[PDB]
Design a protein around this ligand. Structure first.
Ligand code: HHQ
Ligand code: HHQ
Lengths: 203, 203
């Protein structure tokens, strides 16, 4: 009699884990394709779904970290976004902490993305005339060896500087898109594959 | 090449329709069992999922109406909730408009629920000392024949009145729970049934 409710709660948990995996994947494809409004709406759906879940596997937790990293990278130019209890931590600094803490291989693409997020954390502060904030951000990032170049640019206050062109926001975005592309190849969820069978069935 | 994106968007739409049906059903069971926080969290999930959808069948739309009716009934004692553009419309009046407009059979249980929502729309106004609001609500509902009894109670200002005991809030709630019980028997969604196979598989 009482085990009937336990049965239902258990099925709701399996189904919610599947919805989480579907939404995490769909958030990755939206970011990769640059569908900004879709990324926003799928983030809202993943957030509500997470509040409905009580248990999580290490793979679901890792996925949640990757999606949090993507949400923060998307808000990297929005210096008004606060993702942590410490209000001084800019959105690109918050993406960088997740990136350097995810259980993933530290390959050359990983290092490249990290160094690009670092330069851009300082660059968006200089881009909005917040020269003192760029210095504060730089202190929390240095506490890579190219810090001598960054510190020299913060003091000079040169906004449209040549260094920020080579290591551009677009370059950081493109290197991150390559990573998202790679993980998706890896990922094939129960939900995506079943719905894709219904689509091929109607062809 | 371009049809590959169309394929993905189509599968995301099928998968989102399945998530909607799962969440609508789970909202119904939470209401029926009186799991209030679960109802709140599942409502938030269904809302976000709906904002991600662009097409809907008449069956999905009807389900959305039933769930909106349940959300408003849950807030029937919350006279501070505004569900429509007209701010004067109390939550129980908003549930009553959906109830009398859903494409469903108008059986004796339907009529009973409607008449119980009507009495309670006036009763929660008298319960909070808003005697003029009960009169205003009564004007928009009458503009059953028992209106002579209701109007006589509004004028007298008798809060803990005998009429409201027979046609109690608990009675309205219980008659609505019977209805929710009945529709669930009807109810088998793709998501609930697949997750329930995984649960039986682990037994
Ligand atoms: O809390 C979260 C979860 C996910 I998935 C994305 C963003 N924030
Ligand atoms: O807009 C909505 C949808 C649903 I399902 C429940 C409540 N509000």
């Amino acid at each position: 009699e009482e085990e009937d409710a336990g049965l239902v709660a258990e099925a709701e948990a399996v189904a919610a884990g599947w919805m989480l995996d579907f939404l995490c994947l769909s958030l990755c494809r939206a970011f990769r394709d640059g569908r900004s409004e879709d990324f926003r709406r799928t983030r809202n759906s993943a957030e509500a779904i997470i509040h409905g879940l009580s248990s999580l596997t290490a793979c679901q937790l890792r996925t949640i970290y990757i999606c949090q990293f993507l949400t923060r990278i998307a808000a990297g130019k929005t210096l008004d976004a606060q993702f942590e209890n410490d209000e001084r931590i800019t959105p690109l600094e918050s993406a960088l902490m997740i990136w350097g803490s995810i259980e993933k291989e530290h390959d050359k693409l990983h290092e490249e993305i990290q160094n690009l997020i670092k330069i851009q954390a300082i660059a968006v502060c200089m881009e909005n005339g917040n020269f003192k904030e760029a210095e504060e951000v730089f202190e929390r990032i240095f506490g890579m060896p190219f810090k001598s170049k960054l510190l020299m640019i913060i003091s000079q206050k040169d906004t449209f500087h040549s260094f920020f062109q080579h290591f551009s926001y677009n370059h950081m975005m493109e290197k991150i898109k390559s990573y998202v592309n790679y993980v998706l190849s890896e990922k094939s969820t129960f939900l995506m594959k079943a719905a894709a069978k219904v689509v091929e069935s109607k062809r």
